[PDB]
Amino acid sequence: QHFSIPTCYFPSTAVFVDDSRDFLLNFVLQLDEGLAYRVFDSPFEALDCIKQKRDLAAIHAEVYNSRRFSEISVVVVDYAMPGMDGLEFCRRIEDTNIKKILLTGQADEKLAIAAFNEGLIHRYIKKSDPDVASLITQSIHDLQLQYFQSMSDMIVRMLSVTSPNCLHDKKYAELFWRLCREKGIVEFYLADNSGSFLMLDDDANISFLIVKNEADMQLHYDLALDNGASGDVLDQLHNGEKIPCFWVTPQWNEWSNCLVPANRFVSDETYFYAYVQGAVLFDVRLDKILSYHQYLEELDAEEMFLN
């Protein structure tokens, strides 16, 4: 219901717990390239690995964490695992916010329904379903989003900040996610109180989606009016034709190139935004950022399922 746009997002790791190598080979080789995953044939070793893995400017600082992509967001577990059934496996990680996909047998649907209603698991799929491979893949994408949506609750609490209203706007979120796909964005991080986002592609190229609400536009118009800006600047800020692209008040003669043409989006409220290339809002050290493409290349072939 909330955080249709999460406070942050980046490619995360899914864990597959299954005792059928033939099922895993058929499944993982249909997956889209770009999904990081780990495979365990034992629920005990999978649990041990999960256990051992465990202001507003602090959000985008996560991009300097080279191990962020190894965050485990979704687990896919077969209920018929030897040693420990799939539901008992999920109970021992239900304290975390990992999203659980249960692969059910022919006589396990009632047990999975109860677990789904209690919130123990978030998805159950018949392992013998002819579309099982595509159903798991779609649920992985859906639950990796829900993982960061659940993260957004604790992040705004930990930082003692209030979320921008645009993050809960369903119409605007669809525009946000479709723009991310148009620009090849794989990870983003909330940048200011109005809903701006630091954005990166798989090569860690920097870009920003600067977002302003009507209250911000009125504040910028009042600042330019109190500062005595050019006649065009007052008309552009009043009509909402352009938005400020800075992060501090510019000089009366500097408002010219500190503005960028903006799009207007009317939904739950009126937003003004512009997608700009480069580090525009604040400085970003590209030399201390591990891109996602380089993370996938630096994956050690020793601990790979496909070797």
Please state, in angstroms and rounded to a whole number, the distance separating the CA atoms of residues 139 and 234.
Answer: 49
Which value, to the nearest 10 degrees, does the dihedral of the CA atoms of residues 124, 128, 133, 134 take? -70
Give this entry's resolution in angstroms. Answer: 2.1
C-alpha Rg value of the chain to the nearest Å: 23
Kind of pairing between the strands at 72-78 and 13-17:
parallel
Give dist(CA 246, CA 251) in Å, integer. 12
Angle subtended by helix axes 132-158 and 21-28, to nearest 10: 80
Q: How far apart are CA 122 and CA 87, in angstroms?
A: 12
C-alpha closest to that of 306 among 70, 21, 72:
21
CB proximity list for 53: less than 8 A, separation 6 or greater: 70, 72
**Helical packing angle, 214-227 and 231-239, nearest 10°:** 170
CA atoms within 13 A on the CB side of 293: 8
Nearest to 161 by CA among 57, 304, 254: 57
For residues 40 and 147, the answer to whether their CB atoms sit within 8 Å is no
* Among 87, 94, 135, CA closest to 115: 87
Structure tokens at 39: 């495979």
Query: Bridge partners of 213?
Result: 271
Cα pseudo-dihedral 175, 290, 288, 144, rounded to 10: 50
Is residue 35 a contact partner of residue 256, using CB atoms and an 8 Å limit? Answer: no
Q: Look-up: residue for tokens 């723009």? A: 179
294, 202 Cβ separation under 8 angstroms: no
* φ, ψ for residue 16, nearest 5 deg: -110, 120
Distances (CA, A) of 114 to 75, 79, 89, 118, 124: 19, 14, 15, 6, 11
